[PDB]
């Protein structure tokens, strides 16, 4: 068996998505997500100008050899751009392998471990009354788990947000108190701190949120120095999640082996595909850590299909984020996965069950969109 | 899909082997090794009286769910008997899954990572001259790696050996000096200490063996207290291997994460099958540890086939032990794996490529054989 | 002195019990429990097919030599099946040694350290009102210590239970609040978490239970990774117990030496007998850990007699679990130990004071019964 | 002051170089290296499609604010592609700031700390005789420090090398013995292991090289798991260097703070520019670590000029690698730095003293060239 062609498709049906398609000499093809929000074209070049020319002629069944060849062979290791490119290749090859086996991908990984996959959605409001309404709307859509974000009183190219830590820490516990009073204890509640605190501030916030029994408090502090979480863990029993921005097991080995976190959020598209995320999830399982894949709209339906197959098998599954794609996004990527009453199943189609409609994708050209930056009230460039 | 039957076959074509066969409602079947040397019938009962009745009617594609069901569901966790029974089930189910995919098993794991699999053999002699001759005979059979064991001057139910640590430590370095003088530096040399030393004795021996640059020094001290290896590692750069007797990742997590060993020897048949050994090997890979599967004759050809498929894929492969089965053993277990000039390939037959000839197996009834014990010169019951 | 015979008796007077009887050439005999709930026949084979043939002709007075011979000589070390078989031998030999000395067993261990042995019983209800009634019934039977378990609102082969961690954590503290309000502070209250939490969940629960001053919170998290308890210990002063499922000191050395637990629950029948439990209890004593032997109905009266003799001597005794055997069970195993007003004494008969009525045991053939498994609400196979 | 334009120039005068030029509204401009060997065009896109559009209109004097804006604002942090793009911006802005100050760049950093900057060159041979000749040729060019690499007996798209660790470890100490015998003890000798060993192999090699007193042994093991170096450091006093492949302080914080290495090799072009390398070098200085910047031909003369200015100031300077550019490369990048008798000075021109001749650069179009991969003798994809 040989790879005869590989191509990168770029489309913007509401937001930018980048997709790799690998075609074999037997006409079976596979696809993988390569989208890196706000830096998309750097991955397109990494693939087109460097990795795709090496793929041609190789045996697509050698998933591990090709993963190692690109991971080690880049010489400069890890990193968002190269690991997203490698993820796209790895997912497309697992898609091919499952189609050659005539099995849905979850069967190749070890089969199903559960009948349904818990998800969570968003509830965002500019103030408390609107936040409470957004939680009602999320519950009415059948979600059993809801991430709550609320505006704080007094608070093509990157937008610039302004931030006050002190105002946020003083107000946000009152939001969770009000949500618990209105909606009761059974609903799972999540909160994303979005990198804005120092560890002793995160320790304070985790303690203040303990009475509300959150499913997790996410991304509390920037995590390049993984020891940052030791101080948080010493002060609170609010569960901790981190890692949507990671691209390697080396970004989280210490967080996990020291039991400093409860959920690892690192994704298939951003951390080298199914081959690497199997290793992260298995390492996590030794230390009570569960998967909580990031699932914002900037991960394409191809990533979602691969993630749901992974979620259906992995023993230490925690939850799957679901920020829904629009109708126009979904039409470009026909898929077998489905949602019902707060939960997903991956679908029984062979492969990860996702395809790309190339004719439709071609109707929507790339349009640049970058992520915001965040400044403190004095103008300091902070963490967004 | 359903399991319709499962049975345990016991045969003694020169030594005892126990094999599980699982049969599906589509007539595809899979087999797994269940042999536990010197306690064989305890596994037969564990399977026949407890696990097989639960398997019937289950979907064999759910490998992970069934692994967890038995691993956790036994309540009393881990252990040689239960983990060998679970290994037999797990291997038979991966054999079925690969046959359903119409692929050799290594393809399901991620594909081949190498063209050939390095093995090692034995060279044993009662004295130095005979040891040197045994090394020549091993080299003439095409082996590139040879385990050297030599008798020490002055040294149905279990045989009782006698042991002197001091005589062994004084003599064994001279054996490796003589082997290097006769055979040169290119041949890989291994030594199995077989549990007989304390850590400071193993540190001394490792230092004394450094000039001879061994591939490994194996099982230097009993390893129930994994911190025993820290003191060895602080004193020698001879590479260290351990773990043929282990049955769980929990027997070696600290040895590996602290970089106290170089090779993990734990096997598919004795540690819960391919599902658990994938997790051990991947954990090992984060810490520079390589696989060195045990491969004595008491692991059946079914274990060897599964091991060779695993070895063909796993990135951090080190070596495969090969103590050859006899012609009568091989005839009971037709297999696709082959040996050439010191190396193996697993074969391209779907599954792990091994089968059992039930009619032939029935010609050789069980015959008890137990492992020796070892006593010190004063009669103390020691480690064999 | 020589062992002339040894036999395994299997009986099901309401539930399965396995018993070893060793007979000496002077006609003195000893018995030991060999019951391993839900895997019973695997121990029968381990004994009959491997260990008993080695016992014959040996001097029964050599308890330590025989313990080492089997512990080390199995080659594959530790584990539920082999350690239960070895426990049966070790207890039967201590029973013989005490009969040869013409002493109750506790005298051989070092004599009595207390006049009475505190026990605890069960109080289980499907809801809070019924739980409160079960606590009244337990108190009326004279118990001074009561384990409380309550159903949670909204929650031959293994039964399958369903589990929600979040519902349990939200409700269970209210059960202990109600029990304290009704029964006051003097009664000792225990709770068994039964392996269902992660460490930060157990930390949360321990904190929530602090106002109710439990004697212990038991088996909070699966303990194969012993470092799991470090995080619990950093967050709560509720006392911690673990270890009914352990079979070796190596399962708990780190829990004890780091002062991560308060009570070790590992038993004579499941962890290699009196010889090994003397070593566990003495190690525990250096680190303030007290014995809290498991004492569910699946440990036979032979185990109970040995445990009570051990409990009467050991300095760092904490408590003895007592889930009562039925009248039919007790009739098969005449014994000297007695209960009075919440406490036991072991009895003054030589040996451990327990015997087996072989004629009566023969009236009740083995009947398979396995332990349940537990699944999460999505179907994930969890810890029961 | 404002940035009015910024552009990326790509040229291949013998090998590919990528250069950023930032132009201010006062006509002062600055340049920075953006070359990432073997992935060059991914950086071109990162700059052109994402970062340059944000630069336009910003005040170039705000070097720190712009560094933080891009480092944090990318959201996905660190990594070879983004950190090389950010390095190009940071160096071009320091070039502008020094030109506005009318000072050579080293004056802005704190002034000169030394009169001359020690460098090292290459001596490579296919065998020992040729290696010895290459060392003579290097000495005759005035170098006082020489990296020695020798072939080992029996050993557009990526070339595939083959590797044997055992043959290398057996032979390489003899090469250093011969070099010391011929050239004496005063010459500084370096060796690059190039990622090929495990830590205990590197410990062995470091010990074997101790009699030859190397300046350093470099890149002994892949360093994603920084604790890998602890075991090397416990066994040898050969000095250790690592880090040409790093892009962040987070790749080396533990190596440095634990005193596991002697020289940090991370470069201005690959790790976020002068702003980040000032922080790495200062952190290193607290722990006795000295700078040893990588200086292979794939770092352009723009990187060399910035590095030499940095080297002239930094207190804890160790050495500068110098693998010489060709005449055609040098003509595209006129520069003030000069070499004399083994040492450099950075030159007294304002800025880093390097410029790009755009007309000449335009004569040499991009031509793809990728780095080799390395396979073991069995075909395993290894570290190159
Ligand atoms: Cl990158
Ligand atoms: Cl066992
Ligand atoms: Mg987030
Ligand atoms: Mg061995
Ligand atoms: Mg319990
Ligand atoms: Mg180098």
Tab-separated table of N, CA and C in Angstrom, chain D residues 8-19 35 40 300 328-329 332-333 356-367:
chain	number	residue	atom	x	y	z
D	8	UNK	N	9.467	40.163	4.754
D	8	UNK	CA	10.263	38.974	4.923
D	8	UNK	C	10.982	38.728	3.606
D	9	UNK	N	12.312	38.615	3.704
D	9	UNK	CA	13.163	38.351	2.540
D	9	UNK	C	13.682	36.930	2.665
D	10	UNK	N	13.528	36.152	1.593
D	10	UNK	CA	13.953	34.750	1.556
D	10	UNK	C	14.989	34.620	0.452
D	11	UNK	N	16.128	34.022	0.795
D	11	UNK	CA	17.231	33.896	-0.180
D	11	UNK	C	17.967	32.594	0.091
D	12	UNK	N	18.551	32.025	-0.974
D	12	UNK	CA	19.319	30.757	-0.837
D	12	UNK	C	20.731	30.855	-1.476
D	13	UNK	N	21.632	31.602	-0.842
D	13	UNK	CA	23.000	31.729	-1.380
D	13	UNK	C	23.824	30.528	-0.908
D	14	UNK	N	23.427	29.315	-1.298
D	14	UNK	CA	24.109	28.118	-0.834
D	14	UNK	C	23.253	27.321	0.144
D	15	UNK	N	22.441	28.027	0.932
D	15	UNK	CA	21.450	27.390	1.819
D	15	UNK	C	20.403	28.456	2.110
D	16	UNK	N	19.228	28.057	2.620
D	16	UNK	CA	18.127	29.031	2.804
D	16	UNK	C	18.292	29.891	4.068
D	17	UNK	N	18.084	31.198	3.877
D	17	UNK	CA	18.002	32.143	4.995
D	17	UNK	C	16.756	33.008	4.852
D	18	UNK	N	16.092	33.220	5.991
D	18	UNK	CA	14.905	34.066	6.043
D	18	UNK	C	15.218	35.232	6.976
D	19	UNK	N	14.876	36.450	6.531
D	19	UNK	CA	15.223	37.688	7.238
D	19	UNK	C	14.011	38.610	7.330
D	35	UNK	N	15.375	32.333	10.270
D	35	UNK	CA	15.594	31.023	9.598
D	35	UNK	C	15.356	29.843	10.552
D	40	UNK	N	11.492	26.255	6.769
D	40	UNK	CA	11.632	27.702	6.669
D	40	UNK	C	10.365	28.470	6.331
D	300	UNK	N	21.738	32.565	10.325
D	300	UNK	CA	22.309	33.492	9.355
D	300	UNK	C	23.327	34.473	9.966
D	328	UNK	N	29.629	33.392	-0.650
D	328	UNK	CA	28.375	33.840	-1.244
D	328	UNK	C	27.362	34.234	-0.148
D	329	UNK	N	27.326	33.475	0.950
D	329	UNK	CA	26.438	33.804	2.097
D	329	UNK	C	26.838	35.134	2.699
D	332	UNK	N	25.745	38.417	0.858
D	332	UNK	CA	24.348	38.840	0.982
D	332	UNK	C	24.137	39.623	2.289
D	333	UNK	N	24.981	39.363	3.303
D	333	UNK	CA	24.807	39.962	4.638
D	333	UNK	C	26.065	40.709	5.106
D	356	UNK	N	21.339	43.519	5.095
D	356	UNK	CA	21.062	42.594	3.995
D	356	UNK	C	21.070	43.349	2.689
D	357	UNK	N	21.823	42.828	1.720
D	357	UNK	CA	21.840	43.399	0.374
D	357	UNK	C	20.655	42.793	-0.384
D	358	UNK	N	19.576	43.561	-0.498
D	358	UNK	CA	18.325	43.006	-1.053
D	358	UNK	C	18.460	42.642	-2.525
D	359	UNK	N	19.230	43.427	-3.276
D	359	UNK	CA	19.420	43.160	-4.701
D	359	UNK	C	20.174	41.863	-4.895
D	360	UNK	N	21.229	41.670	-4.120
D	360	UNK	CA	21.931	40.415	-4.213
D	360	UNK	C	21.083	39.222	-3.710
D	361	UNK	N	20.352	39.396	-2.603
D	361	UNK	CA	19.538	38.297	-2.072
D	361	UNK	C	18.546	37.793	-3.122
D	362	UNK	N	18.024	38.716	-3.912
D	362	UNK	CA	17.037	38.384	-4.945
D	362	UNK	C	17.584	37.475	-6.075
D	363	UNK	N	18.910	37.346	-6.166
D	363	UNK	CA	19.530	36.482	-7.191
D	363	UNK	C	19.456	34.986	-6.829
D	364	UNK	N	19.066	34.672	-5.601
D	364	UNK	CA	19.141	33.292	-5.134
D	364	UNK	C	17.809	32.811	-4.574
D	365	UNK	N	16.992	32.169	-5.416
D	365	UNK	CA	15.672	31.727	-4.928
D	365	UNK	C	15.761	30.553	-3.974
D	366	UNK	N	14.767	30.482	-3.073
D	366	UNK	CA	14.577	29.349	-2.170
D	366	UNK	C	14.732	28.010	-2.860
D	367	UNK	N	15.401	27.092	-2.163
D	367	UNK	CA	15.461	25.717	-2.622
D	367	UNK	C	15.302	24.792	-1.424
